[PDB]
Amino acid sequence: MKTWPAPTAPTPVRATVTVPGSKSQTNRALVLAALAAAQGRGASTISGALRSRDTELMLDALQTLGLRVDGVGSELTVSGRIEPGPGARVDCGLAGTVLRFVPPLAALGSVPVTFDGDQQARGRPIAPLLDALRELGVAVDGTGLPFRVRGNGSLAGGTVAIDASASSQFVSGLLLSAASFTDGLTVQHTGSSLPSAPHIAMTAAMLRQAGVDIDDSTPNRWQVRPGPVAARRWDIEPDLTNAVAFLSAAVVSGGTVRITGWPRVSVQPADHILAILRQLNAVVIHADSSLEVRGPTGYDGFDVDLRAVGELTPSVAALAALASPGSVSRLSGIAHLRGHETDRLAALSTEINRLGGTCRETPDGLVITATPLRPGIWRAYADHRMAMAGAIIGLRVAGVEVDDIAATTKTLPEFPRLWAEMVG
């Protein structure tokens, strides 16, 4: 496959970028629309939905369970029932949200639904969630992919303790269907280290928008009351995590990038993002329903806790590599990233060091010393965020090529075009 040459920015980037819908939100909207339809409440529509490999894997998963998902552009309509056919098999691909959000949903069906995935997907944690489902009265064959959920059209529900240290999606996946369990559900995360708090809060918030009663007033504990899931119209926000790759362009080039339709109040961690940009002395302003960032003329090393926003680590590692010569940066809170798409700490370390950089993995992150970089081939490891991180680096390093820029289709199929239009 041909490499993709990352275009350089010998001068301040200046652009207005529209990024498409949020993956996290879109795939939550699809699961909740599914539950409503399967409850008999009717069809739901998702407006401004992300169309990408991860959301296509989700609706296909949903269509495999018996539901009907229509729409050619960003408007998706969900209808039908959970009624899987014989030999039903969900392809989880590399979408963690399918792997983690759909086995609870399939338990409401009445047939064995098999879950399978990419060889790379088979490295992703899932065993805790499967054990949870067993505790909650579901027959599940297998402890990893491929596994079978043997549904008897009913999930007892109740109370369960889970160690979700490896992935917040184990809590989110349980919470999304719990309204449909007879007894509803009480989930207790045991121990500590619960990554990605904003994404469990995103689940809680969208549940409440669907009229589900969820109690999260005590940390590490969630209580959902059995009840109707409303059929409604869902309005999808631009993906703020993808927005940051584009905004990083303003930051490393000292230029100016605006993201259109940035939400003033949002179910995504916008505050965490903006605060991290301002750490690098970027100037961030809200203007005409769009977000504008002005990068500084230079910046030094930073320490940044990413525990709550781990999926920013590749773009922020790229920023750390492009800091003033000699700058030392520390990214922390992100031990759980060894369990992602790919182990992102090893991968980022490998690729940055290949460009002559200095990136050291630590027990919970990366320490990165900015040193001059050289041309090279930046490998994506089939990971959309790794691909975009190489793009950020090539803005400031001539001769950088990403092996597989198509990895970006996971959440942003149009990245090459978008990125080319922003840098030109």
Positions that interact with ligand EPS (CB under 6 A) = 24, 96-97, 167-169, 172, 195-196, 199, 310-311, 336, 340, 385
- Closer to ligand EPS by Cβ: residue 239 or 403: 239
| Residue 24 known to bind ligand | yes
- HEC string of the chain? CCCEECCCCCCCCEEEECCCECHHHHHHHHHHHHHHHHHCCCCEEEECCCCCHHHHHHHHHHHHHCEEEECCCCCEEEEECCCCCCCCEEECCCCHHHHHHHHHHHCCCCCEEEEECCCCHHHCCCHHHHHHHHHCCCEEECCCCCEEEECCCCCCCEEEEECCCCCCHHHHHHHHHHHHCCCCEEEEECCCCCCCHHHHHHHHHHHHHCCCCEECCCCCEEEECCCCCCCCEEECCECHHHHHHHHHHHHHHCCEEEEECCCCCCCCCHHHHHHHHHHCCCEEEEECCEEEEECCCCCCCCEEECCCCHHHHHHHHHHHHCCCCCCEEEEECCHHHHHCCCCHHHHHHHHHHHCCCEEEEECCEEEEECCCCCCEEECCCCCHHHHHHHHHHHCCCCCEEECCHHHHHHCCCCHHHHHHHHHC
Question: Shortest approach of ligand EPS to residue 121 CB, angstroms?
Answer: 12
CB neighbours of residue 49 within 10 Å = 27
Question: Shortest approach of ligand EPS to residue 310 CB, angstroms?
Answer: 5
Q: Which residues have CB under 8 Å from 294's CB, separation 6+?
A: 250, 255, 256, 282, 283, 284, 285
- Closer to ligand EPS by Cβ: residue 294 or 410: 410
| Residue 144 known to bind ligand | no
Question: Shortest approach of ligand EPS to residue 18 CB, angstroms?
Answer: 19
- Closer to ligand EPS by Cβ: residue 13 or 46: 46
- Closer to ligand EPS by Cβ: residue 294 or 340: 340
| Residue 124 known to bind ligand | yes
Question: Shortest approach of ligand EPS to residue 179 CB, angstroms?
Answer: 18
Q: CA 269, CA 397: separation in Å to the nearest integer? A: 30
Question: Shortest approach of ligand EPS to residue 167 CB, angstroms?
Answer: 4
| Residue 385 known to bind ligand | yes
Q: CA 372, CA 423: separation in Å to the nearest integer? A: 22
| Residue 340 known to bind ligand | yes
Q: Which of 75, 135, 292, 311 is catalytic?
A: 311
| Residue 23 known to bind ligand | yes
| 56 a catalytic residue | no
- Closer to ligand EPS by Cβ: residue 9 or 162: 162
- Closer to ligand EPS by Cβ: residue 148 or 385: 385
| Residue 168 known to bind ligand | yes
Question: Shortest approach of ligand EPS to residue 280 CB, angstroms?
Answer: 21
Residues in binding site for 3-phosphoshikimate: 23-24, 28, 167-169, 196, 311, 340
Residues with active-site annotation: 311
Annotated binding site for phosphoenolpyruvate: 23, 96, 124, 169, 344, 385, 410
Binding residues: 23-24, 28, 96, 124, 167-169, 196, 311, 340, 344, 385, 410
